[PDB]
Amino acid sequence: FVPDVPEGYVAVQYAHRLFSSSLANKRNRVTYTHPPTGMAYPSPTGRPH
Amino acid sequence: EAFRWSRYFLDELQLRRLSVGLRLITNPRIARRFNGVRIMYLTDDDPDPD
């Protein structure tokens, strides 16, 4: 049984290009950028489906 | 006449300082014992006590 993926979720082909290492609120959160629309999301929690 | 009331059996003068203490006891700056906590779940980033 493989849990299928909901409606929201987007298809992102992983690659090294995405996960930069930037600064946000002191600390160097390892931001993920999300190709579709550049929007680095430092903290793991709250990325975008 | 001393007899009609009796303040509270407290010196006529100390009662006067006492006028101040209730004032001191109510002053915001000395309330530091807040009531309710709120539980939820955010990420402590840029912690501003307030």
Whether B46 has its CB under 8 Å from any CB of chain A: the answer is: yes
Experimental approach taken:
cryo-EM
CB A40 within 8 A of CB A32: yes
The amino acid sitting at A49 is H
3-state secondary structure of B3: coil
Contacts of B46 in chain A (CB under 8 A): 25-26
How many Cα atoms occupy the beta-carbon half-sphere of A9 within 13 Å? 7
Resolution in A: 3.1
Q: Which residue blocks in chain B are alpha helix, DSSP H? A: 14-26
What gap in Å lies between CA A33 and CA A31, rounded to an integer? Answer: 6
CB A12 within 8 A of CB A19: no
CB A24 within 8 A of CB A42: yes
Contacts of A35 (CB under 8 A, 6+ apart): A12, A18
Q: Identify which of A27, A47, A29 has the alpha carbon closest to the alpha carbon of residue A37.
A: A47
**Nearest residue on chain A to B47, alpha-carbon basis:** A25
Q: Provide the phi-psi class of A25: left if phi over 0, else alpha when psi is between -120 and 50, else beta.
A: left
The amino acid sitting at A42 is P
A33 Cα to chain B: minimum distance (Å):
19
Tell the burial category of A42 from Cβ atoms under 10 Å away from its Cβ (0-12, 13-18, 19+): buried
